[PDB]
Curated annotation (Swiss-Prot), chain A:
GO terms for cellular component: mitochondrial inner membrane; proton-transporting ATP synthase complex. It comes from Yarrowia lipolytica (strain CLIB 122 / E 150). This is ATP synthase subunit delta, mitochondrial. GO terms for molecular function: proton-transporting ATP synthase activity, rotational mechanism. It is a peripheral membrane protein.
Swiss-Prot record, chain B:
Its main location: mitochondrion. F-type ATP synthases have 2 components, the catalytic core F(1) and the membrane-embedded component F(0), linked together by a central stalk and a peripheral stalk. The central stalk, also called rotor shaft, is often seen as part of F(1). The peripheral stalk is seen as part of F(0). F(0) contains the membrane channel next to the rotor. F-type ATP synthases form dimers but each monomer functions independently in ATP generation. This is ATP synthase subunit gamma, mitochondrial. It is found in: Mitochondrion inner membrane. The keyword Signal does not apply. One of its GO terms (biological process) is proton motive force-driven ATP synthesis. It comes from Yarrowia lipolytica (strain CLIB 122 / E 150). Keywords: ATP synthesis, CF(1), Hydrogen ion transport, Ion transport, Membrane, Mitochondrion, Mitochondrion inner membrane, Transit peptide, Transport. Mitochondrial membrane ATP synthase (F(1)F(0) ATP synthase or Complex V) produces ATP from ADP in the presence of a proton gradient across the membrane which is generated by electron transport complexes of the respiratory chain. F-type ATP synthases consist of two structural domains, F(1) - containing the extramembraneous catalytic core, and F(0) - containing the membrane proton channel, linked together by a central stalk and a peripheral stalk. One of its GO terms (cellular component) is mitochondrial inner membrane. The keyword Ligase does not apply.
From Swiss-Prot, chain C:
The gene is ATP1. This is ATP synthase subunit alpha, mitochondrial. Disulfide bonds: none annotated. It comes from Yarrowia lipolytica (strain CLIB 122 / E 150) (Yeast). Belongs to the ATPase alpha/beta chains family. It is found in: Mitochondrion inner membrane. Mitochondrial membrane ATP synthase (F(1)F(0) ATP synthase or Complex V) produces ATP from ADP in the presence of a proton gradient across the membrane which is generated by electron transport complexes of the respiratory chain. F-type ATP synthases consist of two structural domains, F(1) - containing the extramembraneous catalytic core, and F(0) - containing the membrane proton channel, linked together by a central stalk and a peripheral stalk. It comes from the Eukaryota. F-type ATP synthases have 2 components, the catalytic core F(1) and the membrane-embedded component F(0), linked together by a central stalk and a peripheral stalk. The central stalk, also called rotor shaft, is often seen as part of F(1). The peripheral stalk is seen as part of F(0). F(0) contains the membrane channel next to the rotor. F-type ATP synthases form dimers but each monomer functions independently in ATP generation.
UniProtKB/Swiss-Prot annotation, chains D, E:
F-type ATP synthases have 2 components, the catalytic core F(1) and the membrane-embedded component F(0), linked together by a central stalk and a peripheral stalk. The central stalk, also called rotor shaft, is often seen as part of F(1). The peripheral stalk is seen as part of F(0). F(0) contains the membrane channel next to the rotor. F-type ATP synthases form dimers but each monomer functions independently in ATP generation. Its main location: mitochondrion. Keywords: ATP synthesis, ATP-binding, CF(1), Hydrogen ion transport, Ion transport, Membrane, Mitochondrion, Mitochondrion inner membrane, Nucleotide-binding, Transit peptide, Translocase, Transport. GO terms for molecular function: ADP binding; ATP binding; ATP hydrolysis activity; proton-transporting ATP synthase activity, rotational mechanism. This is ATP synthase subunit beta, mitochondrial. The chain holds residues 341 to 506 of 509 of the full protein. It comes from the Eukaryota.
Amino acid sequence: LTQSIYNQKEVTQVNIPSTAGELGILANHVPTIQQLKPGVVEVIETNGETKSYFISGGFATVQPDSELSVNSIEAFQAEDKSLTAEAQKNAQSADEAVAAEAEIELEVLEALA
Amino acid sequence: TLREIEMRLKSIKNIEKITNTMKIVASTKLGKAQRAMATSKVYNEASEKVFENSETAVPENIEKRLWVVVSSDKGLCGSIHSQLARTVRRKLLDGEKLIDIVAVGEKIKAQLGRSNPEQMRLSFGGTGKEAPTFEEAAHIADEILALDTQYDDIEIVYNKVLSGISFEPIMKESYSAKAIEDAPKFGQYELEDDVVKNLADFSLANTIYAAMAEGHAAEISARRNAMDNASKNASDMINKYSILYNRTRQAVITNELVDIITGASSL
Amino acid sequence: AAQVKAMKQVAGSLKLFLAQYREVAAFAQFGSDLDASTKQTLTRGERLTLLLKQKQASPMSSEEMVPLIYAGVNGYIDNIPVKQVEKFEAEFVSYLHANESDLLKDIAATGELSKENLEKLKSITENFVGS
Amino acid sequence: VYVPADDLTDPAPATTFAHLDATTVLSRGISELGIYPAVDPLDSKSRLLDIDVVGQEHYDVASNVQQTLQAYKSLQDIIAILGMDELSEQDKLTVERARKIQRFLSQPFTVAEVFTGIEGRLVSLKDTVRSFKEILDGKHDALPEAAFYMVGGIEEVVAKAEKLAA
Amino acid sequence: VYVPADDLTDPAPATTFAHLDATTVLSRGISELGIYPAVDPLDSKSRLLDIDVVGQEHYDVASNVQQTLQAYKSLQDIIAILGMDELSEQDKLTVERARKIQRFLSQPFTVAEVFTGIEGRLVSLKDTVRSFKEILDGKHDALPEAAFYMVGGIEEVVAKAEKLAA
């Protein structure tokens, strides 16, 4: 990604917001892979240390190695909007030129946290 | 002549000012290139290196191949675009005659358009002005899917770099949807019957970003070899043009004084 | 030993600050791939050499030069562009003569700068920042 | 005609060129590369290089060889600094031909058996002309520059290329 | 010796150099390194640096110092930029020994007891040659550069290191 955060050393606990619904991959999980949707992502170290990230797309390749892989475009902490309110209204109102650009930019703001 | 020696000195002596101040500037780019190479080498392999363990390569059927060359339009970077033209050509005659090429940059459109013009119809210039970003990868990868579907054997040609010593001519491969699905050991994955077509386009658009980063490092790590030798060959030209200037000055002082002594002692 | 005593400490660094500056000011223009440690010598030197400008038949006395060169070594003019720095010099020497005409009088009579007179210029640096 | 200190502007050789119908200038830098005879192809001239003497067939080749050898030594600065790889796609092919021509111009003389050991070589006038047409064109462009060194025509180049191919 | 227009082919220096047996070059850049006197160690040469004059003992050590200062000058491109960690362990030691061999060149003058105040130190010849081998042959290369900065002999270096420790 534009940033690189996680090594592949130790098994950890992570949740994923998939297109088949928000799931959870722990330990020797089945190589279940499908595209993720722009939403919140919860990551927790051992003993319950609270962390968080964000995802704007990509898959989550899993192999019987007890280690999860995740790729996206955005990967920052949650701590890191009047212009978006106009960009949201400007997306709601689109003419005959392909609207598709309008709807997609609002599905990433559905998290809003 | 004498008038142009000092004029030709000021050019060569100030060319040394340019080449010597492009050997360390590229050393800063290498630190930015590897951090832009680790942007794509520990990110894309997760969807490829582990994905190549399924080994969906070499479809046995014979169809039209595709070779996408990766380069930047900025020159003065050694012989990157010189051996790359041979690398595609050495496997062409002995690929055979069927091949198509997507040229990336201004320097490569004349490297292959003058040799194989029919083998391409779309090619954009303006790639390497700075460090390439992801947004420009989707502006060319989708255009490969916009022309026609066609090939199921797309292979990317880039330059590997190790220790920054030299470039490396190879031919990496990017699996296609038909090949991806036709895998002998793919049943270990359990995709929920979703779209398997987006798996190829996500990996293909990330091979380009992984090829526009390691080939962007072989450019910098070979630019120095074309800017370091341009400094030791300029210094070998300054010395031979500094001795000649001392010879010409020594000839002016005499051949003018002799012209005075002749005229003065004529009486 | 022929230089003024109030000029060996303000210009003793100016002499060797333009030594590692001739080669870093000529190549710094074509690309913005410079380091913050190498480009900073140009951000100060481009004003120092611009400070050394002087109009025809306009000789500035010794008591009017020591203030300026002390700020150049400390780099208190790096924010002002290469356009107003020449005007910065125009209305900085006229302010100190109406603010501390006593300091201008002692240096023009003694030429010696102790540890007390150097801290006097610190307060002069806090008043042109809003101008 | 001896030339003092490699100075053709010297008053002694400069007044000699006018009395000569054909000049064969030898260069010192050419002899340092190993090219014998060191006949400078850009300074040796003759009054018989016209179409009224040898025709258009010989004049076309001679005018094409001098143009190739000029394009290589006019870009000698870029080659000696930026390297041969910093050239265009055609100005890199002309250099390849010129380096072959510049060495194919070299010829073992009959008296050169004591300095080189290679037998003496005498090449006909018309045999030389067609040998350059098979170098300027797409023919024999796969052979290296060492196949044209100390050679008399292409008929001996292939004889060396026969040893080279094995 | 002065050189007009930096021309060593000028008749004034060239005729003067023919009578000289040795040259002592003082570089201003060496004085910037804190080296006093500022004798440039790589440009100053002599005719009496031969085994038929000074022997094999004096020649080997003197030919091993300047080659490391030439190595340091060639590795000066990466020390002032990339650092001292991208080197081979022997090349790390080479630059290290170069720092040890460049600081030890400095020597306090006896006539500088008024301008510097440092007690003068005059070193003999045979004690100087023996001192360098005890600095080059991996002996006590852990002490800082302050133990070699402006020192005389080797029995005073270790004696100074006993004062620098505490």
